[PDB]
Amino acid sequence: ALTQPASVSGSPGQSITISCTGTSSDVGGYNYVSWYQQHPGKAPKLMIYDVSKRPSGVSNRFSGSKSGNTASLTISGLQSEDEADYYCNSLTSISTWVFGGGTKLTVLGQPKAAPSVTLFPPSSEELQANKATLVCLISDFYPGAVTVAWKADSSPVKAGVETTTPSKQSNNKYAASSYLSLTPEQWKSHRSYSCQVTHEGSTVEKTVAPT
Amino acid sequence: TNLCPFGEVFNATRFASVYAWNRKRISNCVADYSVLYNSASFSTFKCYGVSPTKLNDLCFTNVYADSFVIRGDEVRQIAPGQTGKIADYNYKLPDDFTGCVIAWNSNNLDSKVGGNYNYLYRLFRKSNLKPFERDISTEIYQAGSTPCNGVEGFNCYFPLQSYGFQPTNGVGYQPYRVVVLSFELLHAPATVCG
Amino acid sequence: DIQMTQSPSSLSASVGDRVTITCQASQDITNYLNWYQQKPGKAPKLLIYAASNLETGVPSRFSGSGSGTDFTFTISGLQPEDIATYYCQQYDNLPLTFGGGTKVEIKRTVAAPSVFIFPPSDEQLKSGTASVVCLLNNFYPREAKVQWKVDNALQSGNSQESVTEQDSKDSTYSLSSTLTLSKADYEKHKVYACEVTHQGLSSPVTKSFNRGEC
Amino acid sequence: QVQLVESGGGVVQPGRSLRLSCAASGFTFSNYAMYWVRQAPGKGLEWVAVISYDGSNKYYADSVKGRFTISRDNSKNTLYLQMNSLRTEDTAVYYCASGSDYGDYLLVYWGQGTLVTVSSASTKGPSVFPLAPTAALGCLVKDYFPEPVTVSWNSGALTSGVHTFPAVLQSSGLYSLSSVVTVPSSSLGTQTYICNVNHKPSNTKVDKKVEP
Amino acid sequence: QVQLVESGGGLVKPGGSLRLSCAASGFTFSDYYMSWIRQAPGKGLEWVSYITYSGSTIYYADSVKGRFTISRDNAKSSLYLQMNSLRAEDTAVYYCARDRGTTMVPFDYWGQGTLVTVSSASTKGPSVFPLAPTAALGCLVKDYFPEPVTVSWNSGALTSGVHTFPAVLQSSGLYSLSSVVTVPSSSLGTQTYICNVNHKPSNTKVDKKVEP
Ligand SMILES: *[C@@H]1O[C@H](CO)[C@@H](O[C@@H]2O[C@H](CO)[C@@H](O[C@@H]3O[C@H](CO[C@H]4O[C@H](CO)[C@@H](O)[C@H](O)[C@@H]4O)[C@@H](O)[C@H](O)[C@@H]3O)[C@H](O)[C@H]2NC(C)=O)[C@H](O)[C@H]1NC(C)=O
C-alpha cells in the first residue's frame, strides 16, 4: 500500500494539500498518477489521471502533482460539498496493482457540538433471560469523537464493551450506541451505574439505578 | 469550398496495421495545417521538401493520407534511406520523399493490458519492398525443399506478427500512431490551398 | 534419422599445412550443411553455412564444398590458435543431427620436458593425507611416461594423471602427476622421487627430495 | 448512455463459491478491458483482478490469486466473475470497472456495485425490548442477523430526533440495533411511541410499547 | 551487443524437474525461431527441442518426447524451458540456439550455456593447500563437487606463466584440479601471492598465501 494522511481538515475558502507517497518502482518511475473522489455510499468518480488531467465535467479548481515518490493533490477554495474521501492510484510494473489508501477530508465551518447522551435500565424482559446489557445511547456530537467508559458506584468498568467509531448524524453532528456486558450479579449488586462519555473532552453524566 | 476532413482521419477511432496500411485520397480543400502545427500535442513533426509554414500558404494539386501503428524505437525508420524491419518488409518511403510525417504518443488509446494482438508487421521476404508496396499476402514462403502445403511448420511461418504493446513498457516500446502525408505536383490545377 | 559420417576421427599437421575433413550423407541433401568450431570449454560458433558460404568475421583460410551426398571442408594453413574440434550438422529434415566429431592438433618438432617436484602442504598433513604432485611443464609431444620411486621402491597403482589441453602460443603440453596417499605411510617413508622417461629426453631425469628437510 | 449494471449477490458461507456478473450498454464492450474493485466496510479500496479485451490474458491480486476466475463474452457483452473458496475477509462491495477509452488499465465508468458478505452466522429474527429510564425512549433490536433492519416510529409520523448509531458486528455474529427519540418530558405521556421493526430478510413485524 | 545469457542450474535429483531461461538483448526477440541443443561432457552434439515463433508448432526429439516443453514470451523477450522426468544421461550443457534469423542465416550467435547435472551426493566446497619450492608456485584444490571451479591468482593480477589443469574424477566421487604458476626467483621473498577460489554451488570463496 501507499502512504496517505489518515485525516485532514480546513476552513471554507482555504487551500489544502494531501500527500500520496509510495516507493520509487511505481509512482517515481512512471507518470501514472490517478486520483478519485467518492461520496459516502455512492460510486467513485475519476478526478485526476497521470499528471493533472481531468475528465470532462470536473471543475478546474482541482489540481494535483507528484514529486520523487510522493504524489500531491491541492484543492483551491474549499466548499461544503467537496468534504468527502479522496483516493490515489498508480501503476504496478511488478505485474500487480495498488491503491493509495485512505484520506478523509472535513471542511470545518462550525466550531464544535456537545453530545446528547441517553441511558436506559435494561428491559424487564431481558433480565428474565439471565441477560443484562446496559445500553447508553449517544447523539448530536461533533466532530467524530466519542468513547465509552461505563462508571460503576466507585470503580471504572470496561468489561466486554462494544466501542463504536463515530458516525455523522443528520444535523451536522454525530451519534453512537453502547452495550455493557456485565454479569447479572454485577448489575444488581451495584448501587447506581453511571454512563460516562468523552466527546472532545466534554463529559455528561447519566446514572441508572435498579428499580 | 469545404475543408479537408482531417478530423475523421487523425481523430479516427480505428487504425489498420502497417502491412495492411490504409489510404484515403483527399483533395479540393481550403487547408489550415497550422491548427495541427501549433497544436503542440504531437511528440514529433518532421518532413522534407517544403517547410510547414511555407506549405501552409501554398497551393497543391493532389495529396494522399496513410496511417498505421509502429513502435517508438523504430519511429526513426520512417525516413528516406533507412533500414530495419519496417523499412525492409512493411513500409519504405522513397528517397525523394515529398510528403509529411507526424507521430504522437497513443499509449492512452491503442495499448491495452495483456498485450494488443491486433496490429501486425511483415517479417521475411525474398526481396526488398518497392516504394509504397503493399503486400497483404500471408502466403507461407518456402525456404526449404519439402512442400509447404499452407500449414505453418518447420519452414518459414507467416510473414505476419503482432506487437505486444503492453502499457507497462518503456517509452520506445509503446505504440506511436503515424499519419504519412503525400504532396505531389502534376499538370492538374492546385485544388487545395489556404 | 538420416545418419551423417565425418571423416576422419583425428588429424595432426604442422603450421602452413593444408588439411581436409570429409562429410558423407545418408540420403540426398543438396546444399544444406554447416561447419562449426568448438574451442574447449567455450561455446561453438558457426564457420560455414549451407556448406558453401563464408561467415562474416571468420578468416578466409577456411573453405569447403560438396553437393548432394558427399561434402568436404578444407583448411589452407593451420595456426597455433585453430586447435579445436570441428562439427557439421544436417540442415533440411525435421530431426536435425550433427556429425561425429574430429580433432585438429598442431605438429611440432620436439620440446624438452621441464621437471619440478613439490612437497605436500603441512596443513594437508594436519588434515591427515599426502597428495604429492610432480609437474612437467611446456613440453612436446603429448605422449610421455612418468614414474614414481619412493625409497627405491617402485610405486604404481595409486597414481593419477591429469593432462592439460595443448597451448595456443607455443602449443605445448603439461601434465600434473599427483600421487595421493595418507600421511601415515607418507611419514613411514622418507625419500620420494618422480622419474620421467620422455622421447625428447636423452636420459631419465628425476627430481627428488627428503621428507622433513624442506 | 454509458452505464453499468451489476448482476447481484448476497450472504454466503466460507469455503464455497459464487458467480457475479455485470451488464453493459452504451459503448463497444468488445473493445475494452474490465476490472473489479472491492472496498471493505468503511475502509479503502483494493484491486482484485483484470481481464484482457478478448478473453486472452488474466491477472489476479496476490490475495485472490488461486481462488478467482474471470470470463467475458463479446456476444452478450456480459462479463462474468467466479469467486471460489469463499473467505470471510473477502466480504465487501465489488465494483464493475470500466476499462474506458482515452485510457488504459485505469478505471473510469465505475458501475454501482454489489454488496456481498461472507459470514456463517445464525440468521435470527429481531427480538425487541423497551428502552425506558428531554427524556428519551427507545426500542432494543439486539442479537439479529444479518444486516440491516429498518425501523420506523408510528409508521412515518415521528421524525424530529432520529439517529442511526454504529451497531458494529458483535464478534458472536449477531448485530444489535435500536431507535431513539429525543423529546422533552412534557410530551412523553400524551402521545404514544411504537417502533415498527421490519427484518426484511425474514419479513417479520415485531413491536413494543416503551414508557418512561 | 547480441548476447544470450542463460539461467541457473546445478544438481537435480533423478527424475526431478527444473526450469531454464535464456534472456536476450540486441535483437527483436519476436522475429526468430528457437532451439535447444545439448552436449554431454566430451561427446557429440545432439538436437533436443525446437519451437517456432508463437508456440503454435512444437517439435521434440524422439528420445525426449513426452517429457520436454518449450514456451515463449514476446514481452519479456525471454525463452523458457521446463524439463520433467529427468533421466541420468541428460546431464550436459544445454545451450540456447536461435534458428533461421531475419536475413536467412541459421544458428547464429547462440551463446554460452548452463551446466545441468543428474546426481545426488552433496554440494560441498573445496579446501586449498599451498605449494612452495628458476622455480614455480601453485595452490591445490581437492575434493570438491560439483563442477565447475574457477581460480584466479591475486584476483587475476597475473596473466602469464599460469596453468590450470582440467579436473578429473577422484575414486571417492569428487573432483580435484590443480593450478601452478612459474616465475624467476628474483622476487620470491619480495612479492606474495594468493589464489582465489570460486565454487558457485557453495560460494565458499577461500584464499591462501604461498611462501616457503
Ligand atoms: C481532434 O480532436 C480534438 C479533440 O476534440 C480536437 O481539438 C479541439 O480543437 C479545438 C479547436 O480550437 C481546440 O480549441 C480551443 O481550446 C481552448 C482551450 O480549452 C482548454 O481550455 C479550457 C479553458 O478555457 C479548458 O476548460 C479545457 O479543458 C482545455 O484545457 C478553448 O478555450 C477554446 O474555446 C477552443 O475550444 C480544442 O482544445 C481541441 N481539443 C482538445 C482536447 O485539445 C482537434 O481539433 C481534432 N482534430 C481535427 C483535425 O479535427
Sequential DSSP letters for chain C: ---EEEE-S-----TT--EEEEEEESS--SS-EEEEEE-TTS--EEEEETTTEEPTTS-TTEEEEEETTEEEEEESS--TT--SEEEEEE-SSSS--B---B------S-BPPEEEEEPPPHHHHHHTEEEEEEEEEEEBSS--EEEEEETTEEE-SSEEEEEPPPPSSS--EEEEEEEEEEHHHHHH--EEEEEEE-SS-SS--EEEEETTT-
For residue E209, what is the DSSP state? B
Question: Are the CB atoms for D125 and D174 separated by under 8 Å?
Answer: no
What residues contact residue C40 under an 8 Å CB cut-off, 6+ apart?
C84, C85, C165
The sign of the dihedral angle between the CA atoms of A143, A148, A150, A154 is negative
A143: part of which helix (H) or strand (E)? none
B85: part of which helix (H) or strand (E)? helix B85-89
The amino acid occupying position B127 is S
For residues E4 and E109, give the distance between their C-alpha atoms in angstroms, rounded to a whole number.
Answer: 8
Partners of E115 in the beta sheet?
E93
For residues E102 and E104, give the distance between their C-alpha atoms in angstroms, rounded to a whole number.
Answer: 6
Peptide bond into A122 cis (omega under 30): no
What residues contact residue C72 under an 8 Å CB cut-off, 6+ apart?
C20, C21, C22, C23, C64, C65, C66
Three-state secondary structure call for residue E71: strand
For chain C, state the CA radius of gyration: 24
A52: part of which helix (H) or strand (E)? none
Q: How far is CA B145 from CA B166, C31, C92, E100, in A?
A: 38, 11, 7, 15
Partners of D165 in the beta sheet?
none
Q: Quick count: other Cβ atoms within 10 Å of Cβ E24?
A: 21
Partners of A149 in the beta sheet?
A196
E26: part of which helix (H) or strand (E)? none
The sign of the dihedral angle between the CA atoms of C66, C70, C75, C76 is negative
**Cα end-to-end span (Å), chain A:** 54
For residues B49 and B183, give the distance between their C-alpha atoms in angstroms, rounded to a whole number.
Answer: 9
**Minimum CA–CA partner of A50 in chain B:** B108
- All three cell numbers of D167, joined, read 451497531
- The closest alpha carbon to D126, from D113, D114, D140, D116, belongs to D140
For residues A44 and C210, give the distance between their C-alpha atoms in angstroms, rounded to a whole number.
Answer: 91
B63: part of which helix (H) or strand (E)? strand B62-71
Q: What is the DSSP string of D69-103?
A: EEE--TTTTEEEEEE-S--GGG-EEEEE----SS-
Chain D residues lying within 8 Å of A96, measured CB to CB: 47, 59, 61-62
- All three cell numbers of D188, joined, read 412523553
- The closest alpha carbon to A180, from A136, A119, A118, belongs to A136
For residues D183 and D185, give the distance between their C-alpha atoms in angstroms, rounded to a whole number.
Answer: 7
Q: Look at chain B and count its residues.
A: 194
Q: How far is CA E27 from CA B77, B183, E24, E74, E109, in A?
A: 16, 35, 8, 12, 11
Most ligand 1 atoms within 8 A of CB, residue of B11, B32, B39 to mutate? B11
What residues contact residue C195 under an 8 Å CB cut-off, 6+ apart?
C146, C147, C148, C149, C204, C205, C206
For residues C116 and E163, give the distance between their C-alpha atoms in angstroms, rounded to a whole number.
Answer: 14
B36: part of which helix (H) or strand (E)? helix B34-37
E135: part of which helix (H) or strand (E)? strand E135-142
For residues D142 and D168, give the distance between their C-alpha atoms in angstroms, rounded to a whole number.
Answer: 12
**Does any CB of chain D come closer than 8 Å to the CB of residue A89?**
yes
**Does any CB of chain E come closer than 8 Å to the CB of residue C174?**
yes
The amino acid occupying position B44 is T
Where along chain C do its domains lie?
4-106, 114-210
Phi, psi of B86 (to 5 degrees): -70, -45
Question: Could you tell me whether strands C145-150 and C153-155 are parallel, antiparallel, or unpaired per DSSP bridges?
Answer: antiparallel
For residues B74 and D121, give the distance between their C-alpha atoms in angstroms, rounded to a whole number.
Answer: 61
For residues C175 and C160, give the distance between their C-alpha atoms in angstroms, rounded to a whole number.
Answer: 10
**Cα end-to-end span (Å), chain C:** 63
Contact B154 C30 (CB under 8 A): no
Closest ligand 1 atom to the C-alpha of A56? Answer: 28
CATH 2.60.40.10 assigned to domain A7-107? The reply is: yes
Residue whose C-alpha cell reads 589464489 in the numeric block:
E195
Give the residue numbers in C contacting B (CB under 8 Å), as ranges: 30, 32, 92, 94
- The closest alpha carbon to A135, from E117, B22, D130, B150, belongs to D130
CA atoms within 13 A on the CB side of D37: 26
- All three cell numbers of E153, joined, read 591468482
- The closest alpha carbon to E174, from E107, E122, E106, belongs to E122
| Alpha carbon E192 to chain centroid, angstroms | 31
**Topology adopted by domain A116-208:** Immunoglobulin-like (2.60.40)
CATH 3.20.20.140 assigned to domain C114-210? The reply is: no
CA of B39 to the centre of ligand 1 (A): 9
Residue whose C-alpha cell reads 502533482 in the numeric block:
A65
For residues C94 and B155, give the distance between their C-alpha atoms in angstroms, rounded to a whole number.
Answer: 10
Chain E residues lying within 8 Å of B153, measured CB to CB: 52, 57
B56: part of which helix (H) or strand (E)? helix B52-56
Residue whose C-alpha cell reads 492538374 in the numeric block:
B188
For residue D28, what is the DSSP state? -
Q: How far is CA B104 from CA A147, B40, B97, in A?
A: 58, 10, 20
Contact C123 E180 (CB under 8 A): no
Give the residue numbers in D contacting B (CB under 8 Å), as ranges: 33, 50, 52-54, 56-59, 101-105
Peptide bond into E14 cis (omega under 30): no
- The closest alpha carbon to C98, from C30, C4, C10, C29, belongs to C4
CA distance B169 to chain A (A): 9
Residue whose C-alpha cell reads 543438396 in the numeric block:
C30
CA of A174 to the centre of ligand 1 (A): 46
Q: Look at chain E and count its residues.
A: 212
- All three cell numbers of E154, joined, read 591475486
- All three cell numbers of D26, joined, read 452504451
- B11 in ligand 1 pocket by Cβ < 6 Å? yes
CA of C11 to the centre of ligand 1 (A): 79
Question: Could you tell me whether strands A34-38 and E127-131 are parallel, antiparallel, or unpaired per DSSP bridges?
Answer: unpaired
Partners of E165 in the beta sheet?
E178
Question: Are the CB atoms for D148 and D126 separated by under 8 Å?
Answer: no
C44, C87, C176: residue with CB nearest E165: C176
Chains touching chain E through at least 3 C-beta pairs below 8 angstroms are B, C
Question: Are the CB atoms for D134 and D185 separated by under 8 Å?
Answer: yes
Same fold flag, C4-106 and C114-210: yes
Question: Could you tell me whether strands A7-10 and A104-107 are parallel, antiparallel, or unpaired per DSSP bridges?
Answer: parallel
**Does any CB of chain C come closer than 8 Å to the CB of residue B142?**
no
For residues B49 and C125, give the distance between their C-alpha atoms in angstroms, rounded to a whole number.
Answer: 86
Closest ligand 1 atom to the C-alpha of B11? Answer: 1
How many helices and strands (H and E) does chain E possess? 0, 16
**Cα end-to-end span (Å), chain D:** 55
Contact exists between D and C (3 or more beta carbon pairs < 8 Å): no
Residue nearest to atom 49 of ligand 1 (CA): B7
CA atoms within 13 A on the CB side of D56: 15
Q: How many CB pairs under 8 A join B and E?
A: 33
For residues D102 and D109, give the distance between their C-alpha atoms in angstroms, rounded to a whole number.
Answer: 12
Three-state secondary structure call for residue E118: coil
The sign of the dihedral angle between the CA atoms of B74, B78, B84, B87 is positive
- The closest alpha carbon to B65, from B186, B194, B192, belongs to B192
CA distance D126 to chain A (A): 14
Contact E178 C162 (CB under 8 A): yes
For residues D136 and E104, give the distance between their C-alpha atoms in angstroms, rounded to a whole number.
Answer: 92
Closest ligand 1 atom to the C-alpha of B39? Answer: 43
Task: Select from B112, B168, B169, B174 the residue whose CB has the most chain D CBs within 10 Å, as the one to mutate to test that interface.
Answer: B112
What residues contact residue D189 under an 8 Å CB cut-off, 6+ apart?
D211
Partners of E137 in the beta sheet?
E181
- The closest alpha carbon to A165, from A175, A154, A152, belongs to A175
- The closest alpha carbon to B27, from B59, B69, B68, belongs to B59
**Cα end-to-end span (Å), chain E:** 47
D195: part of which helix (H) or strand (E)? none
B88: part of which helix (H) or strand (E)? helix B85-89
Phi, psi of B132 (to 5 degrees): 60, 20
**Domains of chain E, earliest start first:** 3-118 (2.60.40.10), 127-210 (2.60.40.10)
Question: Could you tell me whether strands D34-39 and D92-96 are parallel, antiparallel, or unpaired per DSSP bridges?
Answer: antiparallel
- All three cell numbers of D114, joined, read 454489489
Q: What is the DSSP string of A145-210?
A: --EEEEE-SSSEE-TTB-----EE-TTSSEEE---EE--HHHHHHSS-EEEEEEBTTB--EEEE--
Question: Are the CB atoms for E38 and E48 separated by under 8 Å?
Answer: yes
Most ligand 1 atoms within 8 A of CB, residue of A47, A56, A60 to mutate? A60
Where along chain B do its domains lie?
1-114+167-194, 115-166
Question: Are the CB atoms for D98 and D79 separated by under 8 Å?
Answer: no
Contact A179 D180 (CB under 8 A): no
CATH 2.60.40.10 positions along chain A are 7-107, 116-208
- The closest alpha carbon to C104, from C158, C55, C179, C166, belongs to C166
Task: Select from A118, A146, A207 the residue whose CB has the most chain D CBs within 10 Å, as the one to mutate to test that interface.
Answer: A118
Contact B157 E31 (CB under 8 A): no
**Minimum CA–CA partner of C30 in chain B:** B145
How many helices and strands (H and E) does chain A possess? 2, 18
For residues A130 and A125, give the distance between their C-alpha atoms in angstroms, rounded to a whole number.
Answer: 10
Q: Quick count: other Cβ atoms within 10 Å of Cβ D144?
A: 25
Question: Are the CB atoms for A121 and A109 separated by under 8 Å?
Answer: no
Q: Look at chain D and count its residues.
A: 212
Contact exists between A and C (3 or more beta carbon pairs < 8 Å): no
For residues C114 and C176, give the distance between their C-alpha atoms in angstroms, rounded to a whole number.
Answer: 12
- The closest alpha carbon to C13, from C61, C60, C75, C62, belongs to C75
Residue ranges of alpha helices (H) inside E14-91 are none
- Rounded to 10 degrees, what is the CA torsion of D148, D152, D155, D161? -160
Three-state secondary structure call for residue B75: helix
- B10 in ligand 1 pocket by Cβ < 6 Å? yes
For residues A86 and A40, give the distance between their C-alpha atoms in angstroms, rounded to a whole number.
Answer: 11
**Minimum CA–CA partner of E34 in chain B:** B154
Q: How far is CA C21 from CA A164, C2, C63, C85, E58, in A?
A: 90, 20, 11, 11, 34
Q: Look at chain A and count its residues.
A: 211
- All three cell numbers of E128, joined, read 586449498
Chain A residues lying within 8 Å of D133, measured CB to CB: 119-121, 208
- The closest alpha carbon to E156, from E195, E121, E186, belongs to E195
- All three cell numbers of D33, joined, read 478491458
**Which CATH code of 3.40.50.620, 2.60.40.10, 3.60.40.10, 1.20.1250.30 fits the domain covering C4-106?**
2.60.40.10
CA of E78 to the centre of ligand 1 (A): 43
The sign of the dihedral angle between the CA atoms of B107, B108, B109, B112 is positive
- B147 in ligand 1 pocket by Cβ < 6 Å? no
